[PDB]
Design a protein around this nucleic acid. Structure first.
Lengths: 68, 68
DNA sequence: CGGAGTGTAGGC
DNA sequence: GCCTACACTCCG
């Protein structure tokens, strides 16, 4: 599932992957992809990439949604 | 490279550490193991399978070659 | 040597 | 005790 993520700029996509095994079996990891395709696995990695082009203070990494 | 006797596995067992010379993981290493026959092992689950019940590798640290 | 998938420390 | 964030494995 490579989903657009409306609350980021155009081209940015979100993907949620189910862990198949280990002690976190059934938990999920959320990945984001830039228009170029670079993969991001956290909020600060995403903030380091984006800088002041986007405010991410209210941005929920898990859901891809801004939190009012 | 250098196979050095790994005193924590049965006798005849050699370890070898090989530095990655470039790319993103430049300067990390892969650790390899050799049986007496000289089969190369690249992981802890593969080493466990070859050995099964004959050796308890639960406390075995694959990277260092020591117990834990 | 890469990198998807899992381990796991530390903040909470 | 749970989650975030990123290190590390393992096998291609």
């Amino acid at each position: 599932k490579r989903m657009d993520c409306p609350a980021l700029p155009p081209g940015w996509k979100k993907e949620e992957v189910i862990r198949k095994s280990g002690l976190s079996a059934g938990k999920s990891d959320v990945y984001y992809f830039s228009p170029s395709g670079k993969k991001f696995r956290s909020k600060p990695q995403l903030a380091r990439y984006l800088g002041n082009t986007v405010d991410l203070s209210s941005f929920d990494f898990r859901t891809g949604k801004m939190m009012p």
